[PDB]
Paper text:
RNA polymerase I (Pol I) is one of three eukaryotic RNA polymerases and is specialized in the transcription of ribosomal RNA (rRNA). rRNA constitutes 80–90% of the total RNA mass in mammalian cells. Pol I transcription is the first step in ribosome biogenesis and thus plays a key role in cellular homeostasis. Our structure confirms that human Pol I consists of 13 subunits with only one subunit forming the Pol I stalk. Here we report cryo-electron microscopy (cryo-EM) structures of human Pol I bound to different nucleic acid scaffolds as well as in complex with initiation factor RRN3 at 2.7 to 3.3 Å resolution.
Subsequently, we used the DNA–RNA scaffold, mimicking the elongation transcription bubble, for the cryo-EM structure determination of the Pol I elongating complex (Pol I EC). The human Pol I EC was resolved at 2.7 Å resolution. The DNA–RNA scaffold mimicking the elongation bubble contains a 19-nucleotide RNA primer and a 43-bp DNA duplex with a mismatch over 12 nucleotides. The well-resolved DNA–RNA scaffold enabled us to build a large portion of the downstream double-stranded DNA, the DNA–RNA hybrid, and the RNA in the exit tunnel, as well as a portion of the upstream DNA. In the active site, we confidently assigned positions of all bases in the DNA–RNA hybrid. Further, we traced the RNA backbone extending into the RNA exit tunnel over a length of 16 nucleotides in total. Human Pol I EC structure represents a post-translocated state with an empty i + 1 site, allowing accommodation of the incoming nucleotide. To our surprise, the cryo-EM density map showed features similar to those of double-stranded RNA in the exit tunnel. The 5′ end of the RNA oligonucleotide used is self-complementary to the 3′ end of the exiting RNA oligonucleotide, and thus we placed an ideal double-stranded RNA helix (A-form) formed by base-pairing of two separate RNA oligonucleotides into the exit tunnel that fitted well into the cryo-EM density map. Subsequently, the RNA exit tunnel widens up to ~30 Å in diameter, conducive to the accommodation of the double-stranded RNA.
Numbering used by the authors:
A (entry chain A): 296 to 344
B (entry chain L): 12 to 58
C (entry chain B): 1 to 1085, 1092 to 1135
D (entry chain A): 395 to 639
E (entry chain A): 788 to 1032
F (entry chain A): 4 to 99
G (entry chain J): 1 to 67
H (entry chain A): 1623 to 1719
Write the structure that this text describes.
DNA sequence: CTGAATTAGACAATGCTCTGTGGCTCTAG
RNA sequence: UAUGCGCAUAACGCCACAGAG
């Protein structure tokens, strides 16, 4: 438990997007999870290389 | 029947404006136009 | 008094003859010059910054050079002009000029057009000049660039502006926004201060250090610090692009001049010749540079360019000598332009540091106004504009960098200067500052503040609107800090900042206001003749021998330039000669010069020297020089060595040098509108300056031309019968904010105790204090209704039963019309589809449509999609509305009392406002009693009394005066009458004080404050109610309410308020393994059973009752791999 | 690793832009999760308005406007000994005081009463007190969400809530054509209120448990002495201590 | 009673002072003009034949000094010297020497029956404002040693140090107006700053002491059973009910 | 209708999870960094995937079949390719 | 803005006295004598006309039609 | 005595029973303990420690130590939506059958 | 050749509730 | 969830200013 093999995505009803007339706005939790996930994709391509 | 009259802010000339035409005064080209007040019944209390 | 004096037309008493004059309502041939001087700082600073400061700023931008493939390319800006606001090109109009009423009603920005004559050169030869468009910069109204300049009041009425209209504001998106005057340090002056936080900055730094705020022609600003180290060594702090750099003093002093080390030594020990600790310290500082192989000026410049080239970012082909010259031009004493003058000013700052650290002079207080000045709007405009021009050149270089990386086909630049179009356009970064107040800089512009630089100049009334141009703000960083020492009223701001006019609460003492006589120096002059004038007097030049010991001499400073040294037996003679020349305007000495001679006491007083200031942005005020008999402008530092007198009686020969213009010149414009303010307690005058600005008054005269969000209008306002003479000097009957009321001070009804008040019902039913509020809603079909296809126009589908006889044929309500809740508000139809939509009126207040203006774009090519409906909401005074007198006596209306039940006097008169006499003892507003006696005399005799403060002494009292007036009118000397009871019929045994008090109606109404929430919307994360009354939300039952309800012992009442009435959710737990996260519903084959995902058994799942925020809590802890195990028993 | 740190705690990683607040900043501070949404909460069935004085209500009473009285409801269940009162309240409807906003049926379905036609509200008032219908839920009766009337208890409150008499339960007295709450003068030292523009929160308890411990425990009559030192804090003020003397 | 039969008001006849008492007041003010240098010689311990330039030189030495203990002693002796004239003026005007006495005086009936106000307020209306005292000291001096631009540097008179000796009945001259504005602003800033210091203290004490309730054995126990007191308050009694014991 | 809860929390305990216990709790491995497509719907294998809860009332779930008003919400996991520290325990890991 | 029809305190018609008041003041009466010649005896009536600022002549310089 | 001397400068008389309870709490453990986030470390309830200050550090300690909360604190009963033990919650009502 | 007290740095806290408006939330490469 | 008539539309934060008690 000192180490992570995976993050945990909390349920999507606790991470709602706040739209106001044809513009979506993501909250911070989904953005930090996405900044993990883009880097995960980058490492996965680099280990493929 | 009963055209929509708008009044220019500067020259105060009366302007008919339809839906599709660009809005500017037909004489002086000014950009703000005020809507004309027409005769229509409104009831107020004197109180 | 004195001819040509700006305060010679101040009236001896208030007249009331202008209200009934036959020339009333006829607009004058010229604007009243009393009102034009309230915004004169704003206008004149912007006028300098746009015409002359812009030329000086574009001469200050260095020729920008960079690297092509083969040859260096040089860009320089030869000229920059700002054009007045006109229509775009290709626009068919009769008038090319744009006026602020269009930009204010269409909600646009009133923009000039910045264009520059950029020259370019390849291989050192100038190939061609390019006139090039940069962007649109905003224009201050009634500047030299506004189109309302030089117009008479009839011509301002013609262009839908106010007669008597001053402008210190920008229209940014239809909104008048003012740049309030910030407090900066005193420019070009060494402020010796003590800060213990400087000890945490280096290894042996002391708390002592001399700050310096250098500005160059109001287009640059650089803060720098000398620091004192415990071995007597001085470090030189300097900031370059918001980051600090620490240099020993010998490197700077040895790089600035080609002097010998002994000659630099003699300049630093120059006052204190015999202090051997200083002698060893400055020989050690000069030895530090010698030890690092820097024996000439050129080697120091080479070393300093080597060490600062990475952070500094010159082209890589400059020498290191030039790279150090660049930092000494951008960072070190930038107000000087010569390097030897930088040496002498930096030696003076070091000598002041040595005197501070040896305990021999005293700390210049940064909080005293002596050491402070103002940031004017033209200065901020011009600094930000210079930074954006430099950034524009850098963007052109990045454009050539992109075309060298991407399109490197080696096309020569043979008028290939449509790459300027590929440069940045500085319209949007320039409008962001004026639209938000937030400062996005890479330099920081020498300010210590990042935000709050532009504020909406709203026009609730005219008393509030004047306060944006007189406000001097201390800083936004100080409201967060919990100290009470920057919020003190210090005596050095006598006559410069007002003592009463400041807010209450968080900005109290920070948001200060100028006095009525105070004014900001905004003129700029050539001071090339002044040092030769000083040397014609006894001031020896700084190179020549002073013919006496320097310990018996004064350092002379002319605007941050150390001119020389004066024999201390000659320095009062030189100071009196300069004041003589200043007040008589003789030897091109400016009338706004501060001639400060700080004397040599021989004690730890201020650091002595003859300081001479002629720069702008200083506060300056008129007194009268009694020796000359003429009016003199004295400054803030100059004032503390003068003995002004207030009254004629206080003038003593040989003691008082000066005298004020009038004894109430210590007060604001706004604080001079309080009647008899020297009889009130001072918090009650501070409250009136605040709530005089919250008054529903008469804001303006152009109601159809003004499109702003709310606008509070009093219906029938009256001139006060008892007002000061400043009320008539500033012609405040153009915009009156109150009504005279027959106020009786009686404890009669039971509803007027504890600040509440009673209004006669029959006066309210007649026109007393009736009002309106004009709400303007700007409807744009592009901005809000973004569905696609960009072809929405207001209109109806003909034959629509949703809009029949309720909207007009253009889908837009009638102008006489009323609007209840749920009525059709506007209709718009899609032209490429055919479908018409209707929008409904969602406000809960019945309004009447006032006007509807329809807007184009900037070209006259816009389509019928922008509109601006303005609606009138009635807002007559109800129970719960707040009134006020002019003395700080606020009060909620508790009761509208009938006229038959009101106590009638023996004259046959009821009051229309009852006042409870218990608002007097703890508050001591005696001026309200004098105002009522004075207003009753003013009504009876048909007069208008003077209520200017400080005109009544103890010998000739105010109550004696107005009692003799009431006695002459056949009334009581003490203001009381024989009232009867309207409920009983009997004459009341007491003798009731009644008069005429001028009341004000504040804009805080109960119709904007009540709210009730039964059920409604919930927050989508926690399922608790939402906040706000416009979104129809809930109120908090916070932590202290939880605590106070725990103290009652009512536990089911907390369980009610905090579980049943916020979020009672039902979760499913596995009772075996204790987990909310574990149950899961089966995919259907019905059955609808749950399975614990962990133990795979469907038997152990049952419901509990948790808050929904507890479920959000356990999910967010599961996101951190924290297990929450429940004991469910 | 620093992206995962920012997911858990957006202050563990310095020197990185484009971060948003992590789970620590969801939890820790003012405007956190505990202090903003667990220890204090937004709440339904409450009101807030400016207070004005009133002497001609009792000391234990509050003056509720018709603005609030026709909007704050209480879920009164229908028993055979109060069905005439609730039936008249259903007939009056949601815009006539004393009335009712809705009728909650026995299965949890909320029959909203109509402000327009009296025919629907007459049909609902006939249909009260009938036994368990064709739906197999016989456990309960209907609930009529009737308006706050004279005598209902309401917790009043003024921020900052510094001691225990800063929240007291007042009986309601319904006053027409106003928008202010009417408070007696004997309570103003307790709430520290002085009618210069103060506002007060009126929470309306929705259970018989909350009502019964607001009548007994948190009543105004029981808050006569301050808990600080047992001295009185309800008493007459300014005009009264002059005319009694 | 205040509606029907008696009225109640506050005129200017309730705050006026008789002419003979005003002559006494004015000559005590004239004597108060001259009590300057004795209060400086008393604090600096100088012989009474020392010149006015030597006393002023040593008071320029007490000021401009990092010790700041001679200077506070000089302010203390000035405040003690002018408190004598404050008390003489308040004797000369307040009980007798008012135009009306209690009970016919309405301001005295508000003060003395406890309705509203204090005796200090009535003395400030009718006698003097007295010494203006910013943070326990006389109002500050400028860096040149003068208290306002209308006064000399290191002037001995009490008028140049905040002793107002004007009243709200007849007005306040501009220097005393500025000193009084210093004092009013420090009062407003002080009440702005007290609240955030008093709130965090109460929050911390609440979050520790919240679990302590009296059990059914009469022991004040924490929420975990830890016994804090064996009888509440060492006798077991309730504070609102010990008042008549 | 009938009060669905009559059980009662007696206590709450804080601990950590094993990774096997989350991998039993998780319903979808989340892979796609793009939340929404061009047509506005949530993606497959993205952070707003419908194997988690719906984020609004306009959709239903995939694991259960309920709408937004009855779905409890479901956990997903981003399977990291390589091992990172746990920031809750990094100080105690440094000390150990 | 415009002269009130009645006095606020008592209901005396004061709206018909504004042009008479201006004609008396242009005929060189004192304002006290001009208020006496209109029969304004109570000072409630007398401040309604004494303190009236007539903003409608300033507010009609912006008259729109200018024709 | 020191709290009485603080309040008695200002003419304020807090009753002696409040002061005796506060001093008996601050001296419960044999040492004079502050009422701050360092004296709340001794508390039995992790949720009360989280709702007071530095919620993430007490959460981290409760997760490391495996701390149990008995849900008898007034903060812990309001986190989980349970009726608080003081006042009308020290007892339960039973219906005789 | 290592436990010792000390000192600098890091960090966490700093009253409560309520009402509005206005700009921006992904512009730069 | 609110409005309107089961149906149609609207479903927000962060800063900064200003204000109330
Ligand atoms: Mg108040
Ligand atoms: Zn036109
Ligand atoms: Zn299980
Ligand atoms: Zn689901
Ligand atoms: Zn009248």
């Amino acid at each position: 438990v000192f180490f992570l093999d995976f993050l945990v995505v909390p349920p999507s009803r606790y991470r709602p997007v706040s739209r106001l007339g044809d513009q979506m706005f993501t909250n911070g939790q989904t953005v930090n999870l996405q900044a993990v996930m883009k880097d995960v994709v980058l490492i996965r391509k680099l280990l493929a290389l | 029947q009963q055209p929509m009259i708008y009044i220019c802010g500067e020259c105060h000339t009366e302007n008919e404006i339809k839906s599709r035409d660009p809005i500017r005064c037909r004489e002086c080209g000014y950009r703000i136009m005020y809507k004309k007040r027409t005769k229509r019944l409104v009831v107020f209390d004197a109180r | 008094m004195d001819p040509g004096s700006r305060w010679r037309n101040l009236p001896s008493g208030p007249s009331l003859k202008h209200l009934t004059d036959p020339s009333y309502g006829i607009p004058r041939e010229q604007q009243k010059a009393a009102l034009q001087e309230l915004t004169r700082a704003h206008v004149e600073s912007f006028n300098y910054a746009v015409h002359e400061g812009l030329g000086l700023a574009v001469q200050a931008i260095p020729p920008f050079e960079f690297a092509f493939k083969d040859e260096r390319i040089s860009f320089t800006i030869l000229d920059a002009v700002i054009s007045p606001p006109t229509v775009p090109k290709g626009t068919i109009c009769k008038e090319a000029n744009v006026y602020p009423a269009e930009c204010r009603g269409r909600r646009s920005t009133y923009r000039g057009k910045l264009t520059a004559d950029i020259n370019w050169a390849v291989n050192g030869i100038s190939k061609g000049i390019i006139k090039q468009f940069l962007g649109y910069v905003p224009i201050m109204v009634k500047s030299k660039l506004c189109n309302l300049r030089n117009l008479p009041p009839q011509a301002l009425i013609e262009h839908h502006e106010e007669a008597e209209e001053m402008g210190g504001y920008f229209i940014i998106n239809g909104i008048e926004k003012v740049i309030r005057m910030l407090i900066m340090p005193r420019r070009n002056f060494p402020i010796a201060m003590i800060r213990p936080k400087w000890k945490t900055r280096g290894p042996g730094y002391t708390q002592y250090g001399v700050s310096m705020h250098c500005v160059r022609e109001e287009h640059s600003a650089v803060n720098m610090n000398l620091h004192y180290l415990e071995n007597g060594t001085v470090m030189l702090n300097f900031i370059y692009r918001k980051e600090l750099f620490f240099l020993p003093l010998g490197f700077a002093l040895k790089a600035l001049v080609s002097f010998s080390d002994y000659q630099i030594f003699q300049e630093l020990i120059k006052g204190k010749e015999d202090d051997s600790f200083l002698r060893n310290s400055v020989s050690q500082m000069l030895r530090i540079v010698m030890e690092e192989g820097c024996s000439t000026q050129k080697q120091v410049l080479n070393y300093l360019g080597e060490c600062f080239r990475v952070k500094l970012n010159v082209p890589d082909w400059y020498p290191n000598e030039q790279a150090a010259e660049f930092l000494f031009n951008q960072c070190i004493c930038i107000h000087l332009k010569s390097n030897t003058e930088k040496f002498y000013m930096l030696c003076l700052m070091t000598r002041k540091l040595f005197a501070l650290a040896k305990g021999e002079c005293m700390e210049d207080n940064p909080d005293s106004l002596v050491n402070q000045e103002v940031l004017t709007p033209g200065q901020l405009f011009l600094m930000f504009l210079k930074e954006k021009l430099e950034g524009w050149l850098v963007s052109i270089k990045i454009a050539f960098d992109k075309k060298a990386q991407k399109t490197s086909v080696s096309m020569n630049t043979d008028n290939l200067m449509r790459i300027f179009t590929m440069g940045i356009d500085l319209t949007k970064p320039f409008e962001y500052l004026f639209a938000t107040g937030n400062l996005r800089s890479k330099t920081g512009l020498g300010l210590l503040q990042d935000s709050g630089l532009c504020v909406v100049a709203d026009k609730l009334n005219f008393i509030r609107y004047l306060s944006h141009f007189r406000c001097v703000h201390r800083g936004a960083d100080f409201a967060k800090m919990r100290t009470t020492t920057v919020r003190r009223l210090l005596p050095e701001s006598w006559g410069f900042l007002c003592p009463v006019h400041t807010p209450d609460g968080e900005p109290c003492g920070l948001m200060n206001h100028l006095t009525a006589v105070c004014e900001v120096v905004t003129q700029f002059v050539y001071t090339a003749s002044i040092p030769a004038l000083l040397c014609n007097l006894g001031v020896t030049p700084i190179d020549g021998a002073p013919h006496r010991s320097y310990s018996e001499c004064y350092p002379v400073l002319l605007d941050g330039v150390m001119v020389g040294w004066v024999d201390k037996d000659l320095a009062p003679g030189i100071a009196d000669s300069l004041r003589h020349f200043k007040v008589l305007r003789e030897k091109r000495i400016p009338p706004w010069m501060e001639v400060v001679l700080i004397p040599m006491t021989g004690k730890p007083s201020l650091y002595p020297g003859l300081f001479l200031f002629t720069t702008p942005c200083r506060l300056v005020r008129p007194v009268q020089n009694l020796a000359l008999g003429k009016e003199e402008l004295i400054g803030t530092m100059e004032q503390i060595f003068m003995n002004v007198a207030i009254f004629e009686d206080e003038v003593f020969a040989g003691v008082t040098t000066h005298q004020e213009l009038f004894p109430h010149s210590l007060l604001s414009v706004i604080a001079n509108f309080i009647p008899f303010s020297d009889h009130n307690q001072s918090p009650r005058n501070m409250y009136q300056c605040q709530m005089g600005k919250q008054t529903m008054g008469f804001p303006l005269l152009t109601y159809q031309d003004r499109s702003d969000n709310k606008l509070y209008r009093l219906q029938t306002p009256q001139s006060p019968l008892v007002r000061p003479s400043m009320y008539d000097y500033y012609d405040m009957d153009n915009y009156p904010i109150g009504t005279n009321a027959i106020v009786a001070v009686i404890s009669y009804t039971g509803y007027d105790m504890e600040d509440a008040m009673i209004v006669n019902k029959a006066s309210w039913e007649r026109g007393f204090a009736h009002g309106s509020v004009y709400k303007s809603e700007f409807i744009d079909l592009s901005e809000k209704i973004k569905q696609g296809d960009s072809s929405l126009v207001f209109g109806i589908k003909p034959g629509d039963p949703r809009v029949l006889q309720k909207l007009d044929d253009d889908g837009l309500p009638f102008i006489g019309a009323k609007l209840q809740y749920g009525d059709p508000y506007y209709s718009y139809l899609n032209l490429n589809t055919g479908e018409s939509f209707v929008m409904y009126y969602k406000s809960k207040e019945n309004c009447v449509v006032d006007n509807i203006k329809v807007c184009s774009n900037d070209t006259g090519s816009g389509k019928f999609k922008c509109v601006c409906i303005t609606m009138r909401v009635p807002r007559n005074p109800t129970i719960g509305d707040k009134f006020a007198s002019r003395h700080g006596q606020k009060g909620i209306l508790s009761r509208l009392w009938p006229a038959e039940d009101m106590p009638f006097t023996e004259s046959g008169m009821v009051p229309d406002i009852l006042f409870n006499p218990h608002g007097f003892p703890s508050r001591m507003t005696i001026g309200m009693l004098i105002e009522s006696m004075a207003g009753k005399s003013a009504a009876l005799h048909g007069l208008c009394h003077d209520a200017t403060p400080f005109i009544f002494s103890e010998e000739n009292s105010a109550l004696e005066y107005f009692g003799e007036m009431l006695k002459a009118a056949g009334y009581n000397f003490y203001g009381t009458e024989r009232l009867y009871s309207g409920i009983s019929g009997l004459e009341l045994e007491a003798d009731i004080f009644i008069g005429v008090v001028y009341y004000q109606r504040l804009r805080h109404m109960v119709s904007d404050k009540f709210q009730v929430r039964t059920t409604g919307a919930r927050d989508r994360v926690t399922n608790q109610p939402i906040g706000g009354r416009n979104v129809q939300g809930g109120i908090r039952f916070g932590e202290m309410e939880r605590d106070a309800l725990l103290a009652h012992g009512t536990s089911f009442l907390l369980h009610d308020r905090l579980f049943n009435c916020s979020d009672r959710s039902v979760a499913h737990v596995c009772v075996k393994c204790g987990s909310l996260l574990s149950p899961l519903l089966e995919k259907p084959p019905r059955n609808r059973k749950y399975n614990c995902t962990l133990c795979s058994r469907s038997d152990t799942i049952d419901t509990v009752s948790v808050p929904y925020v507890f479920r959000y809590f356990v999910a967010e802890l599961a996101a951190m791999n924290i297990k929450v195990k429940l004991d469910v028993v | 690793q620093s992206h995962v740190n920012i997911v858990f705690d957006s202050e563990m990683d310095k020197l990185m832009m484009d971060k948003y607040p992590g789970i620590r900043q969801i939890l820790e501070k003012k405007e956190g999760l505990f202090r903003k949404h667990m220890m204090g909460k937004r709440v339904d069935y409450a009101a807030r308005s400016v207070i004005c004085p009133d002497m001609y209500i009792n000391t234990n009473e509050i003056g509720i406007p018709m603005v609030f009285a026709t909007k704050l409801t209480y879920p009164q269940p229908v028993t055979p000994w109060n069905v005439q009162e609730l039936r008249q309240a259903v007939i009056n409807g949601p815009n006539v005081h004393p009335g009712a906003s809705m009728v909650i049926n026995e299965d949890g379905s909320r029959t909203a009463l109509s402000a327009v036609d009296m025919t629907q509200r007459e049909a609902v008032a006939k249909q009260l007190l009938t036994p368990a219908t064709g739906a197999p839920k016989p456990q309960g009766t209907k609930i009529v969400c009737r308006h706050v009337k004279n005598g209902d208890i309401l917790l009043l409150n003024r921020q900052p809530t510094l001691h225990r008499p800063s929240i007291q339960a007042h009986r309601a007295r319904i006053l027409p054509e106003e928008k202010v709450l009417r408070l007696h003068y004997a309570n103003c030292k307790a709430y520290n209120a002085d009618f210069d523009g103060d506002e007060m929160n009126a929470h309306f308890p929705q259970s018989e448990l909350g009502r019964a411990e607001a009548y007994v425990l948190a009543c105004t009559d029981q808050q006569y002495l301050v808990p600080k030192d047992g001295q009185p804090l309800a008493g007459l003020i300014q005009d009264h201590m002059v005319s009694g003397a | 009673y205040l509606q029907l039969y008696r009225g109640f008001t506050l005129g200017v006849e309730d705050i006026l002072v008789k002419p003979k008492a005003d002559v006494k007041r004015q000559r005590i003010i004239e004597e108060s003009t001259h009590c300057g240098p004795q209060a400086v010689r008393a604090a600096l311990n100088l012989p009474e034949a020392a010149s006015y330039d030597e006393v002023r030189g040593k008071w320029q030495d007490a000021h401009l000094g990092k010790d700041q203990r001679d200077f506070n002693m000089i302010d203390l002796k000035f405040k003690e010297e002018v408190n004598h004239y404050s008390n003489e003026i308040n004797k000369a005007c307040m009980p007798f020497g008012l135009h009306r006495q209690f009970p016919e005086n309405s301001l005295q009936m508000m003060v003395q029956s406890g309705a509203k106000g204090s005796t200090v307020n009535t003395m400030q209306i009718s006698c003097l404002l007295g010494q203006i005292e910013l943070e326990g000291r006389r109002p500050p001096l400028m860096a040149s040693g003068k208290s306002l631009p209308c006064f000399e540097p290191y002037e001995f008179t009490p008028r140049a140090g905040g002793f107002v000796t004007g009243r709200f009945l007849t007005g306040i001259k501009p220097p005393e107006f500025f000193f009084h504005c210093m004092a009013g602003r420090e009062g407003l800033v002080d009440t702005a700053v007290k609240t955030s210091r008093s709130g965090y203290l109460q929050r911390c004490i609440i979050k520790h002491l919240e679990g302590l309730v009296v059990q059914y054995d009469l022991t004040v126990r924490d929420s975990d059973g830890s016994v804090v007191q064996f009888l509440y308050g060492e006798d077991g009694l309730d504070i609102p009910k010990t008042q008549f014991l | 209708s009938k009060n669905m809860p009559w059980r009662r929390l007696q206590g709450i305990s804080f601990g950590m999870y094993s990774a096997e216990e989350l991998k039993k709790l998780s319903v979808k491995s989340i892979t796609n960094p793009r939340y929404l497509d061009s047509l506005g719907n949530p993606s497959a294998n993205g952070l707003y995937d419908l194997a988690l809860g719906p984020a609004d009332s306009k959709e239903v779930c995939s694991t259960c079949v309920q709408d937004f008003s009855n779905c409890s919400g479901h956990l997903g996991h981003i399977e990291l390719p390589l091992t990172v520290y746990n920031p809750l325990l990094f100080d105690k890991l440094y000390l150990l | 803005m415009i002269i009130p029809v009645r006095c606020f305190t008592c209901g005396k018609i004061v709206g018909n006295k504004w042009e008479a008041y201006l004609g008396l003041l242009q005929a060189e009466y004192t304002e006290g004598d001009a208020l006496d010649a209109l029969g304004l005896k109570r000072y409630c009536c007398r401040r309604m006309l004494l303190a009236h600022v007539d903003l409608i002549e300033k507010l009609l310089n912006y008259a729109p039609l200018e024709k | 005595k020191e709290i009485k001397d603080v309040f008695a400068v200002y003419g304020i008389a807090v009753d002696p029973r409040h002061l005796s309870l506060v001093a008996d709490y601050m001296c419960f453990e044999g040492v004079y303990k502050p009422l701050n986030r360092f004296g709340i470390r001794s508390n039995s309830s992790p949720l009360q420690q989280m709702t007071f200050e530095t919620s993430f550090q007490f959460l981290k300690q409760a997760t490391m130590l495996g701390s149990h909360d008995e849900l008898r604190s007034p903060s812990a009963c309001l986190v989980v939506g349970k009726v608080v033990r003081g006042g009308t919650g020290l007892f339960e009502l039973k219906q005789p059958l």
